[PDB]
């Protein structure tokens, strides 16, 4: 017999105590391919996070039902999706996150883009499912030519996220990533920050608050790097193009994926952002012999820049454990209003077994494809028993529910608006 569908009582219980389980996959947007038998590792290393109070709640539910601590532990593997390459086990013991440090894509694969695939299950072998990263672009190797804006793929837009790493003399063991921990910037061998790179106007003064501009980042512009997790920022920097071990003062082409970069601390005496082992410091450059447009910089002052991305999936077993994996997890990107009032959902991974709920009211739902769903907006009287029209604004959560009771929360709400 089919499993039990979500009851209104169980939806009310969820809305009161929202114990969601979330999987996050953080990763770079591009990756250089490996030829022959070599391994050119993904840098920064993709990182899986188990977020939300739901993991602890789920762990206690399993142990209440007889599971040992080891059987309630989540397990995870990661690999190139849809490939013959082998998956690699992540170590999640004692932590809520793990990095995959030795992934690579062979030129046996002929695809131009791929996704990472994260397979998860509990120690008792109960399946969770398979979660996919965002799309990753394969490059053979970076071009030597100035980057054209016609290929936005390889450029960096103001306000997006980058990672930055330094490597000494071609040695994989020396790789260090810019990262914020305990209020301080440092250069981590194991973790990496994803920093917004904001373009500032040339005349913007140093300050806690600043005005950001739109457009693609070019060498020679002033930028602000802000940790997307901690909110910490560095002082105003001028991002400069590195050639061998010099910074070019006069280059102004667009910044390209995986290019080497130097960050001049604005309004200083030739001071550049520099690591020294784990420490982040500023270090003075030396003017070049007979060349005024270039400055010699410290080994620690050369940073490789790469755009990063984030896949995020959230689920909750609204009627308890189910046989089917909870994946593919639907993701709602937007809601659009559009006879009877209909609400259009746009996103990914929609299926015909989903229903839209407004609050604790299940709505008539029409599946169209994996990216689009239509539902009928409930009359206002389902939320205010006396109302024959909308007297004051009323806001309700929007939630996707599967026929076996899995609940997929969105961050989005619907608001009933009074008639003006």
């Amino acid at each position: 017999s089919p499993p039990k569908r979500l009851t209104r009582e169980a939806m009310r219980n969820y809305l009161k105590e929202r114990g969601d389980q979330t999987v996050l996959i953080l990763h770079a947007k591009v990756a250089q391919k490996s030829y022959g038998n070599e391994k050119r590792f993904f840098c920064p290393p993709p990182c899986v996070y188990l977020m939300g109070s739901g993991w602890k709640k789920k762990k206690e539910q399993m142990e209440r039902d007889g599971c040992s601590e080891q059987e309630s532990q989540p397990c995870a593997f990661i690999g190139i999706g849809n490939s013959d390459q082998e998956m690699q086990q992540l170590n999640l013991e004692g932590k809520n996150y793990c990095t995959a440090k030795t992934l690579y894509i062979s030129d046996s694969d002929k695809r131009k883009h791929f996704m990472l695939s994260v397979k998860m299950f509990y120690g008792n072998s109960d399946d969770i499912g398979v979660f996919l990263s965002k799309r990753i672009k394969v490059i053979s190797k970076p071009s030597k030519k100035k980057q054209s804006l016609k290929n936005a793929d390889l450029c960096i837009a103001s306000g997006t996220k980058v990672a930055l790493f330094n490597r000494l003399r071609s040695q994989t063991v020396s790789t260090r990533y810019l990262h914020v921990e305990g209020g301080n910037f440092h250069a981590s061998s194991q973790q990496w920050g994803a920093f917004y790179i904001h373009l500032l106007d040339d005349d913007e003064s140093e300050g806690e608050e600043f005005t950001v501009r739109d457009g693609y980042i070019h060498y020679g512009q002033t930028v602000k790097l802000v940790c997307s997790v901690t909110g910490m920022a560095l002082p105003r920097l001028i991002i400069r193009k590195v050639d061998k071990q010099t910074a070019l003062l006069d280059a102004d082409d667009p910044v390209s994926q995986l290019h080497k970069c130097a960050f001049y601390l604005k309004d200083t005496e030739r001071m550049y952002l520099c690591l020294s082992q784990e420490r982040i410091i500023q270090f003075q450059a030396t003017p070049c012999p007979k060349e005024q447009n270039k400055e010699m910089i410290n080994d620690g002052a050369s940073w490789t820049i790469i755009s990063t991305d984030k896949a995020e999936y959230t689920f909750y077993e609204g009627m308890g454990p189910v046989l089917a994996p909870v994946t593919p997890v639907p993701v709602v990107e937007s809601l659009q209003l559009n006879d009877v009032a209909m609400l259009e959902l746009t996103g990914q991974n929609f299926t015909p077994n989903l229903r839209v709920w407004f609050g604790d009211v299940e709505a008539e739902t029409m599946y169209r494809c994996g990216e689009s769903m239509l539902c009928v907006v409930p009359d206002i009287s389902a939320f205010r028993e006396g109302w024959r029209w909308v007297r004051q604004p009323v806001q309700v959560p929007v939630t996707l529910v599967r026929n076996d009771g899995v609940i997929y929360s969105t961050s989005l709400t619907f608001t009933y608006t009074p008639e003006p």
Binding site: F185, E208, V212, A233, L234, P235, M271, I281, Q282
Partner: peptide, 13 residues
Amino acid sequence: KKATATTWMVPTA
């Protein structure tokens, strides 16, 4: 239009 962030001081050599 506007952003905000606490600025970390970069120590010198």
